[PDB]
């Protein structure tokens, strides 16, 4: 009874597959007006704790604007270092992770905190395999899996600079 | 391996648990007028084929109104052009996720796998609602395998519910 399989497939079939194909084009139009990354960075906190505002999780992550255009709203966030803009990217949480959290607060589910973490890892692996064989192929999508004990802004910044490195070497 | 498990739990955790608790109150406030049923009837077509308009599936199923808040819609059921029943009718949306996977070659999801997961989705959702407080027996599942009148199949369940109520 692996609930992550359904959550991952539904997350790709019902959401990721419908916003990723034209994601770059929306970013390119924005970048015509600083610069924004080309990929959608999805945060996968293995504790399955998704706050309503990303600014709370890390003070160095601050809202900048929403990416201009079923229709779904993605928003561009800027990451800070000593109060200075070190990176800006489209950041969003893995929404199915809250479904794992709500199940663990549902006594009739039998979902323990250990089961939630275990399913969170399965959700991350399955989405990886899905996107790997996917037309978007993570070419517009990066997966951020992190287990809080940690600067979240530093972890996304590390991947952003690596993406820029790849963009100029390859 | 079984993708229906996630779809069922997500459908209950992310949707059913948030509309079912107050469903009767919204229907009761609506039912103040025209002094209909108290349950949410979910259609589970085992073909995983969800039309955009329910009127197409059966011409005897017609839209009447949307349940006002305190989005679900109230449908009217016909028999020989006469209204024989009125209820809040809706599809099990995760069934389209099963259909889209069957049209995704990279998934490895065959038409036989779609039916198997559709049946598993129905059984799993049944057990979930059985042990659920929010269910309150205000939600009934209509599972039907197309070969049958869908309007008649729902009608059979509405009259049974009224029978039990008295």
């Amino acid at each position: 009874f692996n609930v992550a399989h359904g959550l991952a497939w539904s997350y790709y079939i019902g959401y990721l597959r419908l916003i990723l194909p034209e994601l770059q084009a929306r970013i390119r139009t924005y970048n015509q007006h600083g610069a924004v990354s080309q990929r959608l960075y999805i945060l996968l906190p293995l504790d399955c704790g998704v706050p309503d505002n990303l600014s709370m999780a890390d003070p160095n992550i601050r809202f900048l604007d929403k990416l201009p255009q079923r229709v779904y709203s993605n928003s561009i966030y800027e990451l800070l270092e000593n109060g200075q803009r070190a990176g800006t990217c489209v950041l969003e949480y893995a929404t199915p992770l809250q479904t794992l959290f709500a199940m663990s607060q549902y006594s009739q589910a039998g979902f323990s905190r250990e089961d939630r973490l275990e399913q969170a890892k399965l959700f991350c692996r399955t989405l990886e395999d899905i996107l790997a064989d996917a037309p978007e192929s993570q070419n517009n999508c990066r997966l951020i899996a992190y287990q809080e004990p940690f600067s979240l802004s530093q972890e996304v910044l590390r991947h952003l600079r690596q993406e820029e490195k790849e963009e100029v070497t390859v | 391996f079984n993708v229906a498990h996630g779809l069922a739990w997500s459908y209950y955790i992310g949707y059913l648990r948030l509309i079912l608790p107050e469903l009767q109150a919204r229907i009761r406030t609506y039912n103040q007028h025209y002094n209909v049923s108290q349950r949410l009837y979910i259609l589970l077509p085992l073909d995983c084929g969800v039309p955009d308009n329910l009127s197409m599936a059966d011409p005897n199923i017609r839209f009447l109104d949307k349940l006002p808040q305190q989005s679900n819609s109230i449908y009217e059921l016909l028999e020989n052009g006469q209204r024989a029943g009125t209820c809040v009718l809706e599809y099990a949306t995760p069934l389209q996720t099963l259909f889209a996977m069957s049209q995704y070659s990279q998934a490895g999801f065959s038409r036989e796998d779609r039916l198997e997961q559709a049946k598993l989705f129905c059984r799993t959702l049944e057990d979930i609602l059985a042990d659920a407080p929010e269910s309150q027996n205000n939600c009934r599942l209509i599972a039907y395998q197309e070969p049958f009148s869908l309007s008649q199949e729902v009608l059979r369940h509405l009259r049974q519910e009224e029978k039990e109520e008295v």
Binding site: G14, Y15, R70, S73, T95 | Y15
Partner: peptide
């Protein structure tokens, strides 16, 4: 509907 994820 099933706009479970952000919209």
């Amino acid at each position: 509907p099933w706009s479970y994820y952000s919209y």
